[PDB]
Amino acid sequence: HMNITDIREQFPILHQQVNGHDLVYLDSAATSQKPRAVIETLDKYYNQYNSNVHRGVHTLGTRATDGYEGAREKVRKFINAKSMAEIIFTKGTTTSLNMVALSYARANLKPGDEVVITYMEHHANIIPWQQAVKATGATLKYIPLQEDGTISLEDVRETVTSNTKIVAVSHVSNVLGTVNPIKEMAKIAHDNGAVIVVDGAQSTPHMKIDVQDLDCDFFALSSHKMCGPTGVGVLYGKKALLENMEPAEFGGEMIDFVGLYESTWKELPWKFEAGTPIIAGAIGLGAAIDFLEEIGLDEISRHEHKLAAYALERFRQLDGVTVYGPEERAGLVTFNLDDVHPHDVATVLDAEGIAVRAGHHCAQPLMKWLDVTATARASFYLYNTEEEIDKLVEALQKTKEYFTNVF
Amino acid sequence: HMNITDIREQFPILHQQVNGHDLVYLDSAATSQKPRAVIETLDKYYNQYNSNVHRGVHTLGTRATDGYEGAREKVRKFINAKSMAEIIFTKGTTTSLNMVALSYARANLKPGDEVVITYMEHHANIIPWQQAVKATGATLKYIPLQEDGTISLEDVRETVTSNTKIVAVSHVSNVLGTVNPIKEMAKIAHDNGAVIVVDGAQSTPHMKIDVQDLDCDFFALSSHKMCGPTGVGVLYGKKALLENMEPAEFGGEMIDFVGLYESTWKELPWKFEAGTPIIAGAIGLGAAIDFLEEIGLDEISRHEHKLAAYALERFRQLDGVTVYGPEERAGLVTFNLDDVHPHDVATVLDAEGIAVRAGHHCAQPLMKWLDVTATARASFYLYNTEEEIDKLVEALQKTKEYFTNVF
Ligand SMILES: Cc1ncc(COP(=O)(O)O)c(/C=N/[C@@H](C=O)C(=O)O)c1O
Numbered sequence: 001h002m003n004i005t006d007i008r009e010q011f012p013i014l015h016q017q018v019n020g021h022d023l024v025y026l027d028s029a030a031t032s033q034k035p036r037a038v039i040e041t042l043d044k045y046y047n048q049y050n051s052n053v054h055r056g057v058h059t060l061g062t063r064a065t066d067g068y069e070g071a072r073e074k075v076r077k078f079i080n081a082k083s084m085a086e087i088i089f090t091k092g093t094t095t096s097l098n099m100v101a102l103s104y105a106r107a108n109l110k111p112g113d114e115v116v117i118t119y120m121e122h123h124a125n126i127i128p129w130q131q132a133v134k135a136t137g138a139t140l141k142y143i144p145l146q147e148d149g150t151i152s153l154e155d156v157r158e159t160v161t162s163n164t165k166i167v168a169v170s171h172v173s174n175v176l177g178t179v180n181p182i183k184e185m186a187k188i189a190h191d192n193g194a195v196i197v198v199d200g201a202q203s204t205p206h207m208k209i210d211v212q213d214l215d216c217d218f219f220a221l222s223s224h225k226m227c228g229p230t231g232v233g234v235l236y237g238k239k240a241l242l243e244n245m246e247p248a249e250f251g252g253e254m255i256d257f258v259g260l261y262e263s264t265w266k267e268l269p270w271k272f273e274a275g276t277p278i279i280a281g282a283i284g285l286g287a288a289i290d291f292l293e294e295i296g297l298d299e300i301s302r303h304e305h306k307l308a309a310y311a312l313e314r315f316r317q318l319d320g321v322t323v324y325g326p327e328e329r330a331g332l333v334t335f336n337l338d339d340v341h342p343h344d345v346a347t348v349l350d351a352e353g354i355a356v357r358a359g360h361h362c363a364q365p366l367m368k369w370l371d372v373t374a375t376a377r378a379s380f381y382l383y384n385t386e387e388e389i390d391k392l393v394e395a396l397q398k399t400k401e402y403f404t405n406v407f
Numbered sequence: 408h409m410n411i412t413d414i415r416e417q418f419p420i421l422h423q424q425v426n427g428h429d430l431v432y433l434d435s436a437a438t439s440q441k442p443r444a445v446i447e448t449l450d451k452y453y454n455q456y457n458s459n460v461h462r463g464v465h466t467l468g469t470r471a472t473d474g475y476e477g478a479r480e481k482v483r484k485f486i487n488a489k490s491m492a493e494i495i496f497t498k499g500t501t502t503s504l505n506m507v508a509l510s511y512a513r514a515n516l517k518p519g520d521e522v523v524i525t526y527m528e529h530h531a532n533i534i535p536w537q538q539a540v541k542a543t544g545a546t547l548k549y550i551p552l553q554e555d556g557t558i559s560l561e562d563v564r565e566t567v568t569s570n571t572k573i574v575a576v577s578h579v580s581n582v583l584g585t586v587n588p589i590k591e592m593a594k595i596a597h598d599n600g601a602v603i604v605v606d607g608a609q610s611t612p613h614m615k616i617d618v619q620d621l622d623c624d625f626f627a628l629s630s631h632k633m634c635g636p637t638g639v640g641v642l643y644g645k646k647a648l649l650e651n652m653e654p655a656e657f658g659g660e661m662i663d664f665v666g667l668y669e670s671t672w673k674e675l676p677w678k679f680e681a682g683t684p685i686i687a688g689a690i691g692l693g694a695a696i697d698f699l700e701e702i703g704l705d706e707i708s709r710h711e712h713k714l715a716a717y718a719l720e721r722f723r724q725l726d727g728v729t730v731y732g733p734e735e736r737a738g739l740v741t742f743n744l745d746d747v748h749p750h751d752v753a754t755v756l757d758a759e760g761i762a763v764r765a766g767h768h769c770a771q772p773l774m775k776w777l778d779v780t781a782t783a784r785a786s787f788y789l790y791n792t793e794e795e796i797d798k799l800v801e802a803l804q805k806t807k808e809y810f811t812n813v814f
């Protein structure tokens with residue numbers, strides 16, 4: 001099993017106080033912290049072999065290249081892609097999703113064509129489709145949610161029709177904690193001749209991903225949520241789809257021949273990588289993958305299952321608290337105190353050393369669906385403990401009392 | 408004056424051997440090395456205050472935000488922009504130039520409209536315009552070069568007409584070393600009712616930039632070329648132009664309201680920053696700016712003037728060597744040995760510890776203009792010395808002899 005003490009020892013950022021209390025960092029769904037192995041990877045890159053990429057020029061240039069392409073291979077193995085040609089480094093989930101919207105949607109949508117999404121989608125998995133449908137005169141639809149905030153396959157068969165070109169859905173919701181039935185949704189999407197686009201920002205850090213088994217057409221993830229550097233993400237796509245898409249951006253590196261007016265493109269994946277790439281970040285993403293793999297994604301997932309069950313239980317022991325979403329869930333709890341604004345919850349918790357987030361969580365439609373204007377959220381990762389969940393629930397109790405007394 | 412010994416002591420990467428020789432890194436135009444101050448800035452971010460951005464949530468979240476926005480202010484002051492609203496963080500020069508091509512060009516070009524570029528442009532400053540003209544049915548033109556690879560203002564007045572909508576030109580060429588007359592070109596562009604787009608990837612690291620004085624409409628730069636982290640760049644644009652451009656990418660952070668089908672955008676600059684931003688990289692870019700400013704850009708520029716003059720002189724002492732471009736120049740020399748392929752020059756130099764680059768340097772049209780298929784390039788920065796230029800010229804001499812003897 002994973003030793004949480006040994007894990008925590010690897011994250012320098014955890015060992016500090018805020019407002020005179022030990023830090024309790026419960027905001028990993030907004031961004032995760034990094035272990036020494038990742039930070040030192042960046043240090044070593046910049047201290048030792050930084051250079052632009054291109055093998056066969058000079059020694060540092062070769063090392064930088066092998067580091068960068070080596071990290072591409074680590075990602076390929078990590079999500080079980082067939083080919084490095086299917087692994088594109090981007091700035092993050094958002095950019096990855098916009099590339100599909102730009103290069104895939106905008107070239108394949110006619111009036112009458114449908115893009116189908118869901119009410120629980122992050123804005124990253126909403127606004128690009130809004131724009132693409134508007135550019136092409138196509139139509140945007142939403143799969144409804146059940147009362148507990150999961151999605152039924154029946155609603156999917158209903159919403160998706162033989163005019164659906166794209167289904168775009170989150171693997172795991174960053175609000176509800178719902179793990180969506182991606183694999184069954186891809187089968188439905190294909191039956192109607194659609195592609196499926198998976199927003200995997202919240203799944204990838206927390207559970208094994210297998211794109212062959214999921215049979216997703218595209219899948220997007222962010223380094224910063226999975227112990228990796230900021231500024232880096234991945235777009236996975238079926239090679240046959242990427243082969244037919246035009247690039248989203250143009251310049252050096254992604255070309256083959258450049259004439260005065262006309263140019264040709266490199267092979268995949270480089271066709272989609274314009275300009276000097278995110279060298280250090282991608283190499284650190286590779287380190288983060290080595291780190292998560294050595295612990296075991298299955299172990300991390302079990303740990304989060306225990307944390308989530310413990311949290312849901314301790315929350316149900318509190319009066320005047322609503323928790324949103326299903327019982328089976330990823331490692332997060334979005335909630336509200338009756339008669340306490342979530343911004344205030346966050347503020348008061350921070351004075352107790354506790355970091356949570358309050359707001360829309362980039363899911364305005366979902367908040368509307370929940371009939372709230374905002375929520376608070378505690379989100380967990382491999383370095384969190386039950387003791388920390390105790391501090392959270394104890395702090396929510398005191399928050400209730402404190403605002404009861406102000407009133 | 409700047410002490411080169413004290414400067415070099417700050418760059419750990421310089422102090423190592425390749426193939427048993429002290430490293431001589433002469434490839435800073437491909438990418439620059441980082442001082443301790445920059446690396447330690449990244450370390451401290453990840454060790455101490457990593458969190459997603461948004462003030463007023465939790466203490467680390469506030470520190471991360473102040474770090475990120477504080478770096479935006481450092482950039483604004485660094486290039487003498489009026490407003491942080493004009494400073495957009497991007498992945499790099501390439502992405503910055505594509506955003507202008509996407510959001511500016513594609514929305515403002517009609518058949519008959521001209522985009523004017525030059526023969527010396529990097530691909531980053533070519534392919535986006537190729538694509539934009541093709542998307543709109545507009546026309547692409549090239550300002551010719553003089554025999555020494557500078558541009559005459561007369562050719563500019565000739566090429567630019569009252570149908571020109573955009574002039575896009577490099578500040579400093581990464582091949583010829585030419586410093587282009589940007590300020591006069593902007594006056595000509597405006598006289599015809601065009602905007603000017605400046606590719607400043609090669610100028611920004613090496614000389615003071617003043618966007619008020621240059622009167623450029625847009626200006627693009629890359630962190631990695633100026634002692635800063637990889638994966639980060641800047642798009643500067645006149646506020647009044649950015650106000651009218653639609654975003655290039657969509658998602659969280661860059662929105663105000665999100666409805667089911669329609670959304671509104673945040674104010675500048677956030678309108679152009681979709682998704683979790685490049686937090687650590689931007690903060691390190693700010694550190695790099697603090698570092699370059701403390702030394703003085705003017706001092707760095709003088710140092711490079713001396714290095715370039717010394718290099719041109721020592722090169723002219725070698726028989727069978729052609730150097731390309733003008734006498735007045737930035738700190739780089741692109742060249743060829745008679746009867747030695749530049750790839751081979753690079754290879755053999757690397758065995759002597761010396762890092763140079765060989766190839767097209769992302770300037771295929773310019774190579775055609777030079778009537779070569781490839782060149783070799785030594786490029787300098789604040790940490791290079793004349794002793795290192797001696798090793799280079801001595802190594803080119805031995806390369807000549809060695810391939811004379813092979814023959
Ligand atoms: C399901 C899901 N989809 C997209 C994103 C956005 O990813 P990036 O901000 O581009 O790295 C995220 C990350 N969301 C963060 C920040 O917006 C949060 O939940 O606070 C996400 O969880």
Ligand SMILES: Cc1ncc(COP(=O)(O)O)c(/C=N/[C@@H](C=O)C(=O)O)c1O
Nearest residue numbers: 275276437499500501529531581608629
């Ligand atoms: C004048 C000029 N314009 C654009 C670029 C490309 O910037 P990025 O690769 O996107 O950081 C660069 C950087 N060029 C490098 C790499 O392509 C080189 O010259 O080797 C440049 O110098």
